[model samples]
Target chain A: TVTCLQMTIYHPGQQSGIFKSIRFSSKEKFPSIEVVKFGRNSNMCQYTFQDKQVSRIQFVLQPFKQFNSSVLSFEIKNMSKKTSLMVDNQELGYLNKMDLPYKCMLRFGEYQFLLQKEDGESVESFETQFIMSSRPLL
Target chain B: TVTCLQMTIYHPGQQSGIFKSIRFSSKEKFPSIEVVKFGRNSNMCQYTFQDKQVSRIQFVLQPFKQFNSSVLSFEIKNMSKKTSLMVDNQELGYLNKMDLPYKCMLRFGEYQFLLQKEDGESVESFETQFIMSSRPLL
Candidate 1:
C-alpha cells in the first residue's frame, strides 16, 4: 500500500507491553474509509483500545482537503467526556476538532502515540510487542 | 444566514407539533462545529435526541468536499448496534456511512427526519414544539 499516514498506539495496561498500529492508504484496514472511530467500543470504532479511562467514543479521524487545495490532510475530533486528548500543545475538549500538524504525539490517559505522515516506501503493516509494567507477568 | 443545508427533526415526541431546525452556513449555531454528533449523549453531540433506540453515540455528521471541487457536501454515519439508519433507499448499519444526497428522509426506529439543502434566502432559526403520540396530553 502507498502509505499516507500512520498511528502507533502503545496499548494501555501496557497489556503485556503489547502495541498495535494502523496505517492509512488507498486500501482501508479494520477501520475502513470515510470515518474512523478510535475508542474501546469495538462496535463504534475501527481502531479500539482497552482503557477504562477512555470514553467509549473517544474520537474520530477523517480525510480533509482545503476549499481549493488538492493536498489531503486530516481532521481529528475529541469525543470523550472525562479524558482530554492532547495533540502536541493543543488540547481538545468534548466535541472539539482541529487539523493535525505534520507529525505529533497524541496523549491521553497516561498513554501516548506517534501519529505521522508516511515519508517514502515504509513498512505498511501492523506489529505487536509486549512489555511488563515493572516486573515479569504474574 | 445564507443556508447551504438544513435538517428538520420533528422532535421525536412530536412534542406539540414543534420541530427543531439546523442550517449550515458560514455562521454556526448550537452545532457550530466541523463535526456534529446526534444521539442521547450530551457530551458527545451538538444536536442530541432523547431516544432509547438511539445509542449513546448513535452517529456523526461532518463536512465533506471532493478533492478538486468546491462543492461542500455532508457525510452521515450510523453508530447504533440494534438500530439501522435509512437515508432514502439506503440502510446504514453499525459504523456505516454515506454521502447525503440533495434531499432525503432519515428514518430510524419510530423516528423519521427531513434532511435537505436550502435554496434561496431562508429563515435561519430554531423552533420547538410539543407532540404527543396518537392522543392528546393527559
Candidate 2:
C-alpha cells in the first residue's frame, strides 16, 4: 500500500525566478494543485503527500523566454518505476532507478513526465539535487 | 560576507501548479531576482544561487485567485535577527528566534517581512518552510 512521502527541491544559484505553482494528478481523486514559492538566499523547500495512481506531471514557467543555451537540470530518487519525459516535442528518455541519484539537463521550456509504477511496489520519496551549474553556453 | 546558496521548496500534496519566479531585495548589492519552477506529483524543487544582503522575499502564485478563509503557513530558521511580517497590511508580529522552527499562519494574500541583522552576526542562511494547508478554515 502507498503511504506518506517526503519531497524536497533545492536551488544552488541565483537564477532570477520563483515558483508560480505546484500540481499533482493521479488516477485516484484528490486536491489537484498547491502553491509553494520563495525568493533568493533561502534554504530547502519540503512537503509531504500520500501515494496514488500517479501519471504524467506538467510544469510551466511564467515570464520565461527560452534562452538558447540555458540549462535546466533535474534529479529524482525513491521512485521504483520507469520514467520518461517530454519537453515540448523533445522526448527525454527513460529515467533509470538503478542510478539511485540521477541527474540530467534540459533546455529551458515546458516539460512533462510519464511515470510507470511497478506492480505492488511503493515509493517512499524523491529529491532533486541542487548543485552549481556550469556557466551558460554562449 | 554573503555568497551563493542552494535553495529548495518542497510540497507534500498532489499540487499541480509549478513555480513561476523568485526575487530578492536588500539594501546591499545582489541579484534582484531568480528563476525556478517545476511540475506535478514531484516532491522537491531546488536551485543554486549566490548569497547577498537579503531582507524580504516576494513569491507569486499562478492561476491563483484569493480565496477567503484560506490559510498560508510558514516556518523560518537560521535567522540571527529580529523580523516581522505584513500580509496585505495585516500585521504578523515579530518572529521569536528562541522559538526555533516557529510555525504561523496568515490569510491568503500578499506578504512582506523585514529582517534586522545584529551588530556583528552573520547568518549563513534562512529557510522558509512550505507545507500544505490544514484543510482550510471555514
Candidate 3:
C-alpha cells in the first residue's frame, strides 16, 4: 500500500515555514519503504529542524506496517532528552513511540509540524502556504 | 440583517477556553446589534480573558454593516498596548481596525480565539472541546 504525508511547518513568515511531498511505498527513494528522522542534529536526522528547541536527533517516523492481522500505523518515537514531545494533547516522551493521527499537530518546544496523511498511489505536486489551525485553542 | 458569531476561546483545559453563540441581530440583548469587547479587564469588556498576556480591553468587534456601496464585513479594532492583535496572519496594532475573514483565528499574546462568522437568523446550541490548529507551524 502506498502512503503519503503532506507536512507544513509554521513559525510565522511573519516566522513559520515548511516542507514535504513524501511518499512511502514501492518506488522512488528507491526503496519499498523508508524511515524519516527529524531533529536539529544534522548528522542523524533526515529532516533537520533549524530551531534551537529541537534536539540533534529528536525523533524518528516510520510508515505503516502490514502485520498478521493488525496494522501498525505511521509511528513516531522521541529520541531527545531535555526537550519534550507531544502529539496533539498527549505526551510522547523519551524513547516513547506513538502513532501519529491522520492529521495532527506535532509539537516540541516552540516548533510545530503538521502531518496530513494521505493514502493513494498517484503522487500530487507540491505548493505551499496555509496555516489553518484545526483546534479551537482559547 | 441577522449575523451570528461562534467564538471559541482556546486556553486548553489542558489550558484554552471559550464562550459564545451570539447573534448580533435585532431582539436579543435589547438591541438590534451590539458591540463586543474582549480583553483581560473585566470592567471594560463584554468578554474577559483571564490570562495575564491579555490587555484589560484588548479589542472591539463590530457586526457587518450594509453600507451605501460596500458592505462592511465583521470588523475589529485593536485597543490594547504592548500586546499585539492578529487576524489570520496579519498584524493589528493599536487603534488599527480591519475586516475579519468569515472564519479566522484571532490572536493576541499567548491567547487564541476562533471567530467563526455565520450569516443566518438561527442561533445554534452551545457545546465545547476541539482544538484544531489551522496552520502548519514548523
Q: Write one digit per residue (lDDT tens) for candidate 1, span B25-64.
A: 3334322224566777767766566555567776776654
The DockQ of each candidate is 0.04, 0.01, 0.01
- Tell how far residue A108 is off in model 1, in angstroms: 0.9
Clashes of 2: 55
TM-score (all chains, Cα) for each model: 0.44, 0.16, 0.37
Winner on DockQ (2 vs 3): 2
The worst-scoring run of ten residues by lDDT in candidate 2 chain A lies at A94-103
Query: Which RMSD values do the candidates have, in order?
Result: 13.4, 20.8, 22.0
Across residues B112-138, which tens digit of lDDT does each residue of candidate 2 receive? Answer: 122222211112222222332324322
Docking quality level of the chain pair in candidate 3: incorrect
- List residue ranges in candidate 1 displaced over 4 A: A1-3, A17-33, A119-138, B1-60, B63-138
- A1-138: candidate 3 lDDT, tens digit per residue: 444565655543212433232222223321212346677766666556556666767776654332221222466666676877778887765555565777887777756778776664422121112343444222
> With candidate 1 superimposed using the best TM-score fit, by how many Å does residue A3's alpha carbon deviate from the native?
4.8
Query: 2 or 3: which has the higher TM-score?
Result: 3
Model 3 chain B scores worst on lDDT over the 10 consecutive residues at: B122-131
lDDT of 3: 0.54
Docking class of 2: incorrect
